[PDB]
């Protein structure tokens, strides 16, 4: 996260950290959507151009973790993966379309003041919340510049009008993505960065006071460059897939 601020304790309880089991290595961000399901970006698990193709056995996940240094004992939880599911039409060759993956935990995580799942948008929550100018919040332990923090980083960013996102990049953009960021002439800056993929773009519902995950950090060009808003997987547009995976029948 570029130009963000240290996270307050317990402010992003659904935050998940995806680590390589051996050697120990922070790979990406993620999010808790149930006590057994973790949502992330597909490229955090499968990306041939970078020699990436992990299996369940290769990874682990940490939840409720506030310091990358310290080990808040009865606060953070470590879980192994039972199974990995990557969107079938995930396009890693061209534009990262449908950059989304689901990781089923071996065993359920008990909810606490420091660990809680984020809500997935229903049709009308998306309809009202997904508007250019409306701000969402992105969180992550990735790079602070185009190393990384000792504490979770947080940054609030405005959703950018599709025509503007499309004009900002040569990558063939799709409806399954959206971009967010500040205008060059506007003062504040901010963006996600490498290491942040898989992390949640969340919004608070003014209707029921709940936080909903509207996107997943997916990609960008550099980090926090003027005129270069970062991109996110559009969670609601891919909800049917998430449903068929979690509710196989």
């Amino acid at each position: 996260i570029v130009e963000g601020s240290d996270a307050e304790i317990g402010m992003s309880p659904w935050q998940v950290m995806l680590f390589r089991k051996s050697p120990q290595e922070l790979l990406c961000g993620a999010s808790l959507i149930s006590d057994r399901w973790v949502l992330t970006a597909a490229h955090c698990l499968l990306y041939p151009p970078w020699d990436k193709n992990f299996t369940e056995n290769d990874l682990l996940v940490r939840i409720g973790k506030h310091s990358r240094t310290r080990y808040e004992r009865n606060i953070e939880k470590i879980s192994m993966l039972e199974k990995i599911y990557i969107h079938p039409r995930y396009n890693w060759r061209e534009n990262l379309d449908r950059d989304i993956a689901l990781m089923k935990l071996k065993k359920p995580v008990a909810f606490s003041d420091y660990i809680h799942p984020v809500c997935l948008p229903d049709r009308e929550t998306a309809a009202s919340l997904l508007q250019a100018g409306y701000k969402g919040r992105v969180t992550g332990w990735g790079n602070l510049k185009e190393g990384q923090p000792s504490v979770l980083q947080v940054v609030n960013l405005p959703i950018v009008e599709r025509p503007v996102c499309k004009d900002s990049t040569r990558i063939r953009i799709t409806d399954n993505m959206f971009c967010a960021g500040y205008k060059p002439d506007e003062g504040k800056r901010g963006d996600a960065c490498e290491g942040d993929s898989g992390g949640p773009f969340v919004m608070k519902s003014p209707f029921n006071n709940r936080w909903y995950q509207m996107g997943i950090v997916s990609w960008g060009e550099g980090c926090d460059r003027d005129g270069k808003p970062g991109f996110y997987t559009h969670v609601f547009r891919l909800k049917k897939w998430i449903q068929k995976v979690i509710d196989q029948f």
Binding site: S34, H116, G133, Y134, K204, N208
Partner: peptide
């Protein structure tokens, strides 16, 4: 379901330091 509500914030009827920026963006 039990989601989107944080024990140390919404459940305590306490806002975090920057969530007003989000609410205000809706206007």
């Amino acid at each position: 379901a039990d989601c989107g509500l944080r024990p140390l914030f919404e459940k305590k009827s306490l806002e975090d330091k920057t969530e007003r920026e989000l609410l205000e963006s809706y206007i």
